[PDB]
Structure 1
Amino acid sequence: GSSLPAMIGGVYSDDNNLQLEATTQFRKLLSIERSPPIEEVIQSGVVPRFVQFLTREDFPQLQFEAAWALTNIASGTSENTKVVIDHGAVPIFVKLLGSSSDDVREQAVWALGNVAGDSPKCRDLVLANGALLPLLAQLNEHTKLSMLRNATWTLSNFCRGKPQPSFEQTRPALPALARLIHSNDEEVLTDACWALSYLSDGTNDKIQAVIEAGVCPRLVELLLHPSPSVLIPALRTVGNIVTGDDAQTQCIIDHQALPCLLSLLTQNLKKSIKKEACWTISNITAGNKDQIQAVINAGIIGPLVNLLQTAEFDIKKEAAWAISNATSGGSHDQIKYLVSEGCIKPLCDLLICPDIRIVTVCLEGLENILKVGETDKTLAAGDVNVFSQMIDEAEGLEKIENLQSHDNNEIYEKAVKILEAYWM
């Protein structure tokens, strides 16, 4: 308000003290908690001067205040961030990653995090200006916690967003991230885990690089972190890795992930966490017979069947895939074990749910079970498929009979196939 002219005059003067005083006043203004007057500061024409001040390497205090003011302008809308970009600040902030002033380096790290954070395009511009390697180079065994937090956050923004950055562009981050997840600091952990969650989201080559960075054992430890801020991205990353092939999935299983994931289903945790854990388990029971056996040995099937029967629909859906996948890849005895743990009833109950994908997955699971029952029938020269009796008793047979009315052709044909094979 009433100070503004002295402030604009200060930044436009050639006097070091007036520049520092004015820039400091603007920095304070831009640091107010709610609705900082970012637009007013831009309109007052001081941004290009702030950007010039970044290059004053004789005057680290002015560089710092100017960097903080610019960080805060770049924390606003996309249009606010675009003004910082248009005035050439990104390459200058990258250069400041090599400043001998610790405060300035940290501020430059923060500023670049805010720019990268705006969108995939701004992230790509930051990476294109070579920010990654100098960001990493000034990290080491001696780095202040305040710097570790800022750099890890910025790193996570360099990795964030769809479409994803090139894997070649973010690869140098993997070894730093693999070290950072050994911090005990929750903030560093939170951001490093988000970053790994982004880098592991994609094709099996991306997952391979993440695994080769050596993170699996520690990611699995962090499944037990008491803070949801850490647990959630750790769990997301673990989930991403087991979308990969059998050997990649085995790298997670080999570090007692399954007992950890089970404890997430049995603690009193938010629905979205349990849903994530069931999805992850589902991608594990989609694996080979040894991996199914590991899920069994961990004691997961009982809890999983209870969820399938009684949980909120979002969780039930993942439990369904999880049980159905196990019936698809499992051996005869593994399948009998799922039946002895009570899976038939809940699979039957879901034949009437409004989601056709789930109806199909339940039907397929029941079909796999029926085949097993029929093999037992043959081997005992028996009269009855025991599992078809069970499906009948769970009121699954009448539900299958009504699926002959279903719109969906795949469901219809499957139902007919099942009825003709086991009830003719």
Structure 2
Amino acid sequence: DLGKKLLEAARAGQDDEVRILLANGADVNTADETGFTPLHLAAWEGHLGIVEVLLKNGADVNANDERGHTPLHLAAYTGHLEIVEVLLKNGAGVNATDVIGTAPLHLAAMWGHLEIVEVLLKNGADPKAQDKFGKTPKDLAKDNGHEDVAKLIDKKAQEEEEEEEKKKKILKDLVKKLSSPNENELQNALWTLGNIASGGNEQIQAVIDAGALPALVQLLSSPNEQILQEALWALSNIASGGNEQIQAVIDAGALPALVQLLSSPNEQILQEALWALSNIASGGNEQIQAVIDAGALPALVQLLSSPNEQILQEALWALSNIASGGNEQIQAVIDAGALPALVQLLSSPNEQILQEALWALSNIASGGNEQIQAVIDAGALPALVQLLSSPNEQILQEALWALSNIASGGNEQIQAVIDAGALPALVQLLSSPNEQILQEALWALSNIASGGNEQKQAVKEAGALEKLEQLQSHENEKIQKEAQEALEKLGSKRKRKRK
């Protein structure tokens, strides 16, 4: 019985024996009759080392016993500050509750564990969580006479409120500086606001709520190229966030100025405008259709003939983000004449613009049979098939994306792919060392098998059956499943955005 041995060893403190039993096959999450794991016991007794060891071997940090107790509950009661620290660092439920609504914070407050109270609050313990008796950690600290803990909680709350108020004050001051007649003052506030907005979506909403969006849009018309670049940077950053925040940027009226700047003669201003547009287009179909209605596609397609490879790369980035989502948007991109430039860029020696044109074409081919047939008519398939032999694994994955999306179409498009000689290289890749490339090639073949009898027969003639059958012994069961589905098909979309 390795489970009982592991439970007892963890409870006693035999680190070496715990390691041995786990190495020998002892279930690291073995529980006794009440749901207490060796991790519960280690946290309870105070065996920090065994806690770490068990967590390293796959112990569930939030395992609930029959009463709903977690190892963190136990650590918070006992007063093992270090174990509380480790468990919280390993993902312990700081606000996890038992059957009577007692959370580790309640325990720490009942017994006056000041250190653990502070740690739990710092790791996200809700100070106001009530238990089955309507008692908060502060309530229990007061009822048990722990003035220290109650004042500590009050102090944490006061510091939190003070920091919130100071942060709001500074952000409002920055939004005010944005309208300054002093150049350096406003330029500094611009840069710092951009920095805040680049910390993630949470910071972005702070800036937006302070009211920086309209001020930034106003600066977009400035004649000071330094100021203008700084404003564009801040806008692109805040548009890197959620789709609601992108829509806020759009409502502020940024798109007209941006599409205007697309015709800018200053390469840095133009790069910043393209960045902003692309981050905007990473949103939903509504934001993308807004970008289209602003008249951006003509200028982007025009910029596809740019000699500056960074501007070209960014224009391809934007076109891809717009070609994501709906078929009306993809058709808009097609109507603007982007496909010729994209197929041309498929033969570019620059691998980055190559991957970008591939990403754009894969997105365009994710649409309907109309858009896929337009990709085919533009002559994309020769180059895509040629790219199947690439040793560059990411470019190969890109070409496979595009080919499986083209093969998601009707029998006519699947026949266009087969006539392009894609099957030998696909069956070959089917035995590739890289599992993601194998999966992509298998998806492609599977969407090919979904055609008529002509296409299924062609796949058979290309020698796919043997390798598909061999894949049944693949260690990865997902590949087994997809290959079996393909076999049954013979014997009878996916879009990507980047910010």
Q: How far apart, in 1, do the equivalents of 2:229 and 2:362 lie? A: 34
| 1:126 counterpart = 2:212 | no
Q: What per-residue deviation string (whole Å, max 9, x for no partner) do you get for residues 93-127 of structure 1? A: 32222223444443433332233334433332222
Q: How far apart, in 2, do the equivalents of 1:220 and 1:370 lie? A: 37
How has the CA–CA distance of structure 1 residues 214 and 325 changed in structure 2, closer, same or farther, with 3 Å as cutoff?
A: same
Pick from 364, 368, 373 the counterpart of residue 446 of structure 2: 364
Pick from 61, 81, 95 the counterpart of residue 176 of structure 2: 95
Q: How far apart, in 1, do the equivalents of 2:207 and 2:366 lie? A: 39
**More displaced 10-residue stretch of structure 1: 175-184 or 164-173:** 164-173
Name the structure 2 match of 1:413: 484
Q: How far apart, in 1, do the equivalents of 2:359 and 2:215 lie? A: 38
Name the structure 1 match of 2:426: 347
Note the C-alpha offset of 1:352: 1.9
Q: How far apart, in 1, do the equivalents of 2:377 and 2:486 lie? A: 33
Q: How far apart, in 2, do the equivalents of 1:249 and 1:183 lie? A: 26
Residue correspondences, number? 322
Aligned AA (2:356)? E
Retained in 1: the 8 A contact 2:469–2:484?
Answer: no
Q: What per-residue deviation string (whole Å, max 9, x for no partner) do you get for residues 29-81 of structure 1? A: xxxxxxxxxxxxxxxxxxxxxxxxxxxxxxxxxxxxxxxxxxxxxxxxxxxxx
| 1:278 counterpart = 2:358 | yes
Note the C-alpha offset of 1:311: 4.7
Unaligned runs of 5+ in 2: 1-162, 493-499
**More displaced 10-residue stretch of structure 1: 231-240 or 297-306:** 231-240
TM-score, normalized by length of structure 2?
0.59
Name the structure 1 match of 2:372: 292
Name the structure 1 match of 2:88: none
Aligned AA (1:420)? G
Retained in 2: the 8 A contact 1:324–1:361?
Answer: yes
Name the structure 2 match of 1:325: 405
Note the C-alpha offset of 1:370: 6.0
Aligned AA (1:305)? V
Unaligned runs of 5+ in 1: 1-81, 375-384
**More displaced 10-residue stretch of structure 1: 358-367 or 189-198:** 358-367
How has the CA–CA distance of structure 1 residues 289 and 107 changed in structure 2, closer, same or farther, with 3 Å as cutoff?
A: same
Name the structure 1 match of 2:384: 304
Q: How far apart, in 2, do the equivalents of 1:99 and 1:415 lie? A: 65
How has the CA–CA distance of structure 1 residues 312 and 145 changed in structure 2, closer, same or farther, with 3 Å as cutoff?
A: same
How has the CA–CA distance of structure 1 residues 391 and 211 changed in structure 2, closer, same or farther, with 3 Å as cutoff?
A: same
| 1:215 counterpart = 2:286 | no
Report matched runs for 1:106-255 at 5 Å.
106-140=187-221, 143-161=223-241, 163=242, 166-171=245-250, 172=252, 173-255=254-336
Q: How far apart, in 2, do the equivalents of 1:419 and 1:147 lie? A: 62
Retained in 2: the 8 A contact 1:224–1:231?
Answer: yes
Note the C-alpha offset of 1:257: 1.1
Retained in 2: the 8 A contact 1:159–1:165?
Answer: no
How has the CA–CA distance of structure 1 residues 369 and 302 changed in structure 2, closer, same or farther, with 3 Å as cutoff?
A: farther
Retained in 2: the 8 A contact 1:345–1:391?
Answer: yes
Retained in 1: the 8 A contact 2:448–2:455?
Answer: no
SS at the partner of 1:98?
coil
Q: How far apart, in 1, do the equivalents of 2:345 and 2:288 lie? A: 23
Pick from 450, 462, 465 the counterpart of residue 391 of structure 1: 462
Retained in 1: the 8 A contact 2:243–2:284?
Answer: no
Q: How far apart, in 1, do the equivalents of 2:269 and 2:367 lie? A: 33
Q: How far apart, in 2, do the equivalents of 1:146 and 1:241 lie? A: 29
Retained in 2: the 8 A contact 1:344–1:366?
Answer: no
Q: How far apart, in 2, do the equivalents of 1:98 and 1:411 lie? A: 59
How has the CA–CA distance of structure 1 residues 228 and 359 changed in structure 2, closer, same or farther, with 3 Å as cutoff?
A: same
Q: How far apart, in 1, do the equivalents of 2:376 and 2:490 lie? A: 30
Name the structure 1 match of 2:118: none
**More displaced 10-residue stretch of structure 1: 396-405 or 122-131:** 396-405
Note the C-alpha offset of 1:304: 0.8
SS at the partner of 1:99?
coil
Retained in 2: the 8 A contact 1:344–1:390?
Answer: no
How has the CA–CA distance of structure 1 residues 371 and 236 changed in structure 2, closer, same or farther, with 3 Å as cutoff?
A: farther
Seq. identity, %: 36
Name the structure 1 match of 2:72: none
Q: How far apart, in 2, do the equivalents of 1:336 and 1:310 lie? A: 23
Q: How far apart, in 2, do the equivalents of 1:158 and 1:102 lie? A: 22
TM-score, normalized by length of structure 1?
0.68
Q: How far apart, in 1, do the equivalents of 2:466 and 2:223 lie? A: 67
Retained in 2: the 8 A contact 1:324–1:365?
Answer: yes
Retained in 2: the 8 A contact 1:91–1:129?
Answer: yes
Retained in 1: the 8 A contact 2:414–2:455?
Answer: no
Q: How far apart, in 1, do the equivalents of 2:216 and 2:196 lie? A: 14
Retained in 2: the 8 A contact 1:182–1:218?
Answer: yes
Q: How far apart, in 2, do the equivalents of 1:216 and 1:373 lie? A: 37
Note the C-alpha offset of 1:151: 1.7
Two-structure CA RMSD over aligned residues (Å) = 2.8
How has the CA–CA distance of structure 1 residues 370 and 168 changed in structure 2, closer, same or farther, with 3 Å as cutoff?
A: closer
Q: What per-residue deviation string (whole Å, max 9, x for no partner) do you get for residues 193-231 of structure 1? A: 222222111322222222222211112223333334323
Pick from 350, 354, 375 the counterpart of residue 269 of structure 1: 350
Retained in 1: the 8 A contact 2:410–2:451?
Answer: no
